[PDB]
């Protein structure tokens, strides 16, 4: 599967992967810089701890980097 | 000292205190709702954990509730 990967924010081929993922959470600068975003590929949807959100998807490049919309 | 206090965001007298404080940190909704803000009074400036910011001041009502400026 092809997925976007942080920190390069480029699409990489993950020949043995099955899902792309988008992990997001707030650090101390979340108000001014938005959520931290971790993009990657995995064989299965990774687990995350409380306060962290994850979305997994199963098509090439389905995890584009989500920028915050600027009012 | 008179200080603003959360969660009512009203001023009250703290006859034993000498500083007002503004304590701010990010929870998981920091990007959309801003930092959480705790206003109170104390006899001395409190200590806070990593990730938490605190500002203390020593004149009446010197800790007004800081809202986020909306572009």
């Amino acid at each position: 599967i092809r997925c976007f990967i942080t920190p390069d924010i480029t699409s990489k081929d993950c020949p043995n992967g099955h899902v792309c993922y988008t992990k997001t959470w707030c650090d101390a600068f979340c108000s001014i810089r938005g959520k931290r975003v971790d993009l990657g590929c995995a064989a299965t949807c990774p687990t995350v701890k409380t306060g962290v959100d994850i979305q997994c998807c199963s098509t090439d490049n389905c995890n584009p980097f989500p920028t915050r919309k600027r009012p | 000292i008179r200080c603003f206090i959360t969660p009512d965001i009203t001023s009250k007298d703290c006859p034993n205190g000498h500083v007002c404080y503004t304590k701010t940190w990010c929870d998981a909704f920091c990007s959309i709702r801003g930092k959480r803000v705790d206003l109170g009074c104390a006899a001395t400036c409190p200590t806070v954990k990593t990730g938490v910011d605190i500002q203390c001041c020593s004149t009446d009502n010197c800790n007004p509730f800081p809202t986020r400026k909306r572009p």
Epitope: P7, K23, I32, R33, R36, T67, R68 | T67
Partner: antibody, heavy 131, light 110 residues
Framework: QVQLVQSGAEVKKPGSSVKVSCKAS????????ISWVRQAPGQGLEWMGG????????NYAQKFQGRVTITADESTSTAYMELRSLRSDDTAVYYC????????????????????????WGQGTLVTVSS | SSYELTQPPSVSVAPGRTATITCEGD??????VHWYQQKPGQAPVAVIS???DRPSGIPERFSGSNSGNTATLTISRVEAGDEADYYC???????????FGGGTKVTVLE
Amino acid sequence: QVQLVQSGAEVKKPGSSVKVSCKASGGTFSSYAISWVRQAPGQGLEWMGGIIPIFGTANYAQKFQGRVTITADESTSTAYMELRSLRSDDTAVYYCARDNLGYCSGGSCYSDYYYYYMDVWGQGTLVTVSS
Amino acid sequence: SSYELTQPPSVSVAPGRTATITCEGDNIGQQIVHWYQQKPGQAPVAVISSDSDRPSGIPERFSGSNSGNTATLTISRVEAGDEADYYCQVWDSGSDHVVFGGGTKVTVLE
């Protein structure tokens, strides 16, 4: 520690243009933003604009928008400021300066831009405009 | 169009007394204010970040506050070498601009 090394002084005619370079010696050039800040003789600091290479997005001060271009060459860790239609009050020392708050770290990146304080400054480049 | 920061051009301080430098703006308490020191012929140096934090190496006598319509840089027990220009700075997300105050020269009296 990271260092920013700028190109040398320039003397330019009115109406011409100048291009100043800022070479960032140190690992992570993509993840940190770079601003250009000038100081006219005897006067205060003035932001020209900045660039965040990992997002390829530049921002300019309105006083210079349309007259200025800021770029970053990632293979050479070099940032550039091009300022056109030069006039006499453009005579100044021009600094490049790094945004202290990196955009990526530990496998993740921030999702919005916001210029923080500037921690590393280049040595400055004197640009003088005259006839 | 863009957010304005107002600094007094000059401040006089007796040696070993407290210098206070203000930076005023419409509800500047909503902004994150940074402060730079600059000596003649040298590049600026950050001395306060994010209202009140000191970058590593900066002496403890530098402190900052920010509330309401005024942010303040305080230099306690000031020393001769603290004579310099001081600039406040914010990022104005409404106009996508870094804004500098006009600078304050702190003169330490003899």
